[PDB]
Design a protein around this ligand. Structure first.
Ligand SMILES: Nc1nc2c(ncn2[C@@H]2O[C@H](COP(=O)(O)OP(=O)(O)NP(=O)(O)O)[C@@H](O)[C@H]2O)c(=O)[nH]1
Ligand SMILES: [Mg+2]
Lengths: 178, 185
């Protein structure tokens, strides 16, 4: 097989780790446990090619920024995430994340990932965002920023239900091969 | 308060597998947990601030946990642990608080600090706030355990430990005739 490296970044608690957990095996973690930095290796199968996909999980919390630059190195693909129940997280995608990825991963395929799609139509989520004077991120908005940042793909998923999770990694694995 | 939750979670876990049930090896009762802190160790630079380019593969995620012997509450120990899957912890190296001879604050990294026992150990806390809480704990502990004495303190604002130049000078273990060996040649 071919060894490829995937790096995943994005706002703290937007769902990066759960994305990895649910994909590589299962069991959706309910309690939030901030990541400092952690590496995983999953063997993905896409288009007949078997790949040893190294997954470099990073920290979304501001208090751990320090270490991130250490995960970026020899990446074959970068996944920038945001949470669809937090419009602000999408703002940061273009107001922070692209810039950072562009600096440490010059010339590496990007995949914008909207997480927690299961919340898009959650009436409670919706009502709460009303107080903040806003609403769940929409597919249009996602695609838009995806295009603005020059992402080579935009996908949505829900680690909670598993929806779209596999597609995210097949896309990432495929992008890692180009 | 994600740190607070983390601490509580870690606490509960740590006491459940290392300070709750009597030792499986021998019926010997377990130590009493006092506190802990998560740390980041660099294998290539274990005793000094590592350079900005030290690769992530060199970093090790560990914990420092403090406990007292069941019998004597003045016999505290420092344990270096590793968290394994399933959420359990595995205790490795162990030191006696008595060995703590120096505590230094790193002036560049807000999470860095160096402890001196037999050797010199550089470690970083996960966050600036965590170093401050831990070191406050460690020094207060030592002070409570050793009749008001303190290890050599470097670069810390003494008021952090409710001390001042005067009190510190009187308490430092370096302030004893045979305590500091001379250089040579
Ligand atoms: N409803 C829903 N909740 C999710 C989903 N993915 C993660 N969460 C929840 O949101 C929180 C954050 O998950 P986490 O994977 O730790 O995100 P993270 O961005 O990797 N965290 P960090 O930046 O701190 O490393 C957890 O409470 C988790 O249960 C999802 O698809 N749907
Ligand atoms: Mg995480």
């Amino acid at each position: 097989s071919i060894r490829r490296k995937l790096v995943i970044v994005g706002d703290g608690a937007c769902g990066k780790t759960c994305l990895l957990i649910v994909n590589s095996k299962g069991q959706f973690p309910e309690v939030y446990v901030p990541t400092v930095f952690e590496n995983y290796v999953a063997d993905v199968e896409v288009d007949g090619r078997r790949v040893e996909l190294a997954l470099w999980d990073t920290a979304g919390q501001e208090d751990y920024d320090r270490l991130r630059p250490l995960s970026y190195p020899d990446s074959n693909v970068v996944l920038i995430c945001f949470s669809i129940d937090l419009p602000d997280s999408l703002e940061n995608v273009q107001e922070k994340w692209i810039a950072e990825v562009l600096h440490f991963c010059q010339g590496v395929p990007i995949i914008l990932v909207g997480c927690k799609v299961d919340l898009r139509n959650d009436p409670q989520t919706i009502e709460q965002l009303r107080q903040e004077g806003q609403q769940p991120v929409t597919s249009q908005e996602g695609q838009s920023v995806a295009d603005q940042i020059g992402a080579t793909g935009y996908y949505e998923c829900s680690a909670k239900t598993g929806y779209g999770v596999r597609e995210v990694f097949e896309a990432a694995t495929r992008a890692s091969l180009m | 308060n994600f740190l607070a939750e983390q601490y509580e979670r870690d606490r509960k876990a740590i006491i459940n597998c290392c300070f709750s049930r009597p030792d499986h090896k021998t019926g010997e009762p377990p130590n009493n947990y006092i506190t802990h802190v998560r740390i980041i160790e660099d294998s290539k630079f274990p005793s000094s601030r590592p350079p900005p380019d030290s690769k992530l593969e060199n970093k090790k995620k560990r914990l420092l946990i403090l406990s007292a012997k069941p019998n004597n509450a003045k016999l505290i120990q420092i344990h270096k642990a590793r968290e394994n899957s399933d959420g359990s912890f595995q205790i490795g190296r162990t030191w006696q608080l008595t060995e703590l001879v120096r505590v230094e604050k790193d002036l560049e990294i807000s999470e860095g600090f160096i402890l001196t026992m037999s050797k010199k150990y550089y470690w970083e806390t996960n966050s600036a706030k965590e170093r401050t809480v831990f070191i406050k704990s460690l020094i207060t502990l030592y002070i409570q355990t050793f009749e008001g004495h303190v290890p050599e303190l470097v670069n810390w604002d003494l008021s952090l430990f409710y001390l001042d130049e005067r009190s510190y000078q009187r308490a430092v273990i370096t302030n004893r005739p045979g305590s500091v060996s001379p250089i040579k040649s």
